[PDB]
Enzyme design. Sequence first.
Site, PDB file in Angstrom:
ATOM      1  N   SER A 288      -0.914  15.625 -12.012  1.00 41.48           N
ATOM      2  CA  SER A 288      -1.183  15.252 -13.390  1.00 41.48           C
ATOM      3  C   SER A 288      -1.447  16.505 -14.207  1.00 41.48           C
ATOM      4  O   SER A 288      -1.972  17.489 -13.697  1.00 41.48           O
ATOM      5  CB  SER A 288      -2.387  14.311 -13.444  1.00 41.48           C
ATOM      6  OG  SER A 288      -2.807  14.065 -14.774  1.00 41.48           O
TER       7      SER A 288
ATOM      8  N   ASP B  48       0.821  -1.204   0.000  1.00 38.39           N
ATOM      9  CA  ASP B  48       0.000   0.000   0.000  1.00 38.39           C
ATOM     10  C   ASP B  48       0.862   1.264   0.000  1.00 38.39           C
ATOM     11  O   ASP B  48       1.350   1.682   1.053  1.00 38.39           O
ATOM     12  CB  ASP B  48      -0.894  -0.015   1.242  1.00 38.39           C
ATOM     13  CG  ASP B  48      -1.813   1.194   1.329  1.00 38.39           C
ATOM     14  OD1 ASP B  48      -1.942   1.898   0.310  1.00 38.39           O
ATOM     15  OD2 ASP B  48      -2.407   1.416   2.416  1.00 38.39           O
TER      16      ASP B  48
END
Length: 330
Positions: A199, A35
């Site tokens: 992004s 994770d």
Amino acid sequence: STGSATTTPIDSLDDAYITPVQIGTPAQTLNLDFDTGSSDLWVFSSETTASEVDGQTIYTPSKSTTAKLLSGATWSISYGDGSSSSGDVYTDTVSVGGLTVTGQAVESAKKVSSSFTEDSTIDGLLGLAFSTLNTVSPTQQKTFFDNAKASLDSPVFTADLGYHAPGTYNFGFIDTTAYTGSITYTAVSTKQGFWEWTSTGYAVGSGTFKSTSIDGIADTGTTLLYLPATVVSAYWAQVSGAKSSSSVGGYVFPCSATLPSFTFGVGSARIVIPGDYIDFGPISTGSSSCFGGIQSSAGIGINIFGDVALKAAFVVFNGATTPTLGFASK
């Protein structure tokens, strides 16, 4: 040194991935959920409340000659999905794919929430976010990666998750055969303890690319892609009959649909998520309403590039002095 381990979907939907991890001496192999959105290595154990164990493999520190109680240390974690666990702490030898760390904090669960009990395939979590998020008290502990880093050939790990198929976690090297083209690297903020990046935009299907900054985290422990409501609405508007259902808990769509792809930007590069990756199947057995793999982050407080996004790429987690993230197509 290096390590290389195969990671395998837990079910036909890729709800999560498990990777075998060797703990203790002699080795006890547990299948852990790696994770990159948390920083605790915790396991089902011989100390876990018996009624909360249902098919998991447990770590028994009393059977490990290298286990030592980390005296006074406790831990307690709550995840974004509302699940939680807590307990005490041992140090022991931990190996992943041939890479060994001695003195790793292994957090032994005394209690786990129902979601964990109900998933027989996940024996614990191995956190790969920054150690500043580790919950051990009163002495915070380091992640497996942080402990291994100095010994690694290069201070990196990579995630290569499969779509409905196994994939690979590598430590200490970049497998140049595992991706196509070049890797595009992008800046990381560690201010919140995550692999947080921005992004450069998105496209829906064959549509034009929208240049827009989307801050979010690369999180292998989250199944879906969570993005701003504007982006998510633009995606599902291209699927006839798709709608946001408050009763179901997100966007659903007719199972008869063909889903468009979704593209996200990494610098000037583009990662394309095929439409099939966005299908999470019937909401309940036999239903013709299917659950979407792109959902709104509104009210999470952060955008999350979870498995739906990451499995479309070869992803480099660069833990150099100034960390960065790399993405390649594959």
